[PDB]
Subunit: 292 residues, 2 copies
């Protein structure tokens, strides 16, 4: 036959040698990428803090921690936060931050942990619920639909919802895939959350299995500052995929997660959304309120 | 042609989803395996602590941190220690322990950083050197000879040595590859450090290139306690490779890293070594004292 011998198994680490793909060209630009979004937007900060304060939230759970840039702000703003994520490569940056400022009492009380949406109920002790559960940055769209039926989407949505205490809040969002799906393109640097100081080009690939949109793959071509010769920049790339969530479908899913027992409202970008409005938002934000 | 479309780039992470190979069957037995090595050996604790105290060492650098079991020992014993490693998947465990015990004065002062033997001098601020520099556990063997000439072994050995202040010590080991190379079989469960509680079989593969032993691959078949039916255990495997370092060759390599200006002495499983000796050591430990 034609066997294939491997030095070490995929997923195994060894002392003294960098992990498997921690050094590729793609991993390098990606790190530059995830660091280009920390400069929070004034609109964003004002909006989120106002919604939380207007509802008297103190206990909040960030279920899309990432590098922790959203949770750090809350921690600073005085909230009592527990941040979780399923990615270790991203958590690592958050853990680094908590250790550095471990001297500030608020950062000592910051709880960062590992968890999955699919098993959230068993990875995090809900207690009696969290005043507010957040999932911003279009992070829910990272979860693909392997089974064909959005069952996994529902299991995760149900798990996340269950972390909200009655009267509590769930602030979850998604990019406007209605526009991207009909347009076939995802505009670069439109983030309402963090002003990106990195230049990039985006190639959008949409995959339609039978007549159903199944995936939107984005190929980022990041211009890196001084990688060319005489100061000129270089250009490297990486790819990331998302599930194309449309407002109507999503609106249905998130409500079904609350058993219908909830108060739902969707924001345009940060301002109210009304169907047919002249304004085409880049992100749709759903703030739900566990009625029961 | 035949192009291949990937969901996301190799090395890139995404918020809500687990990293690339974090869940493979191999990464799950490997996790269990590295956890089965923490029960330090009284012989090991006694030998290492004595050698350190006897030489009046206080500032120690562990360049093969891993899960930090060697360093945790020193941190507890009162030493001033800084631990580095190039693996993020391993460091993750050391960082976790340091945080869980950050309330104990010693663990708060423990420095855990990322570094690579190849760039050691630029990743770690030597200052005026470390009293002792350790690289135990047969970890140097993890570094392969990619270029054919052991240039990378030499560059990593020179960068490490450079971290040893004059009058300082360097404690680095390697398995008896002489024995393994001749016997073609690496015995399982011969660890002089950390008795193991896990049962496992090992298939040894030696690759000789143009008559020069180039590498040793170990396929571990671990018996997992109760993954079978009625209490019955399961069997899973993973693989890890090493560079077969022979005593004579390594002895010349590690001395030249000090430019000859050193006091070399090799131990065989913590007790002195003399060729032809009836006792076949499982590990060869080299203790070098920086003379110049």
């Amino acid at each position: 036959v034609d066997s294939v011998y491997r030095t070490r198994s995929l997923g195994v680490a060894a002392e003294g040698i960098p992990d498997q793909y921690a050094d590729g060209e793609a991993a390098r630009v990606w790190q530059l990428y995830i660091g280009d979004t920390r400069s929070r937007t004034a609109e964003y900060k004002a909006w989120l803090l106002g919604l939380l304060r207007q509802h008297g939230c103190h206990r909040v759970l960030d279920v899309a921690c990432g590098t922790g840039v959203d949770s750090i702000m809350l921690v600073e703003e005085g909230f009592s936060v527990t941040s979780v994520d399923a990615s270790d490569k991203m958590l690592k940056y958050a853990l680094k931050e908590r250790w550095n400022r471990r001297k500030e009492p608020a950062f000592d009380k910051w709880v960062i942990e590992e968890a999955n949406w699919l098993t959230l109920d068993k990875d995090v002790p809900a207690g009696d619920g969290f005043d507010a559960v957040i999932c911003l940055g279009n992070s829910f769209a990272h979860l693909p639909d392997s089974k064909g039926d959005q069952s996994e989407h529902r299991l995760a949505l149900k798990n996340i919802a269950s972390m909200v205490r009655p009267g509590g809040l769930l602030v979850i969002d998604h990019k406007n895939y209605d526009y991207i799906l009909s347009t076939g393109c995802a505009p670069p640097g439109k983030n309402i959350y963090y002003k990106s100081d990195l230049t990039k080009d985006i190639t959008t690939s949409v995959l339609t299995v039978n007549n159903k949109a199944h995936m939107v793959t984005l190929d980022y071509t990041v211009q890196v500052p001084g990688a060319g010769r005489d100061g000129a920049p270089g250009f490297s790339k990486f790819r990331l995929s998302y599930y194309p969530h449309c407002l109507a479908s999503f609106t249905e899913l998130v409500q079904e997660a609350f058993g219908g027992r909830c108060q739902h409202s969707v924001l345009g970008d940060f301002k109210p959304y009304r169907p047919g409005q002249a304004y085409v938002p880049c992100y749709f934000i759903h703030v739900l309120k566990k009625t029961g």
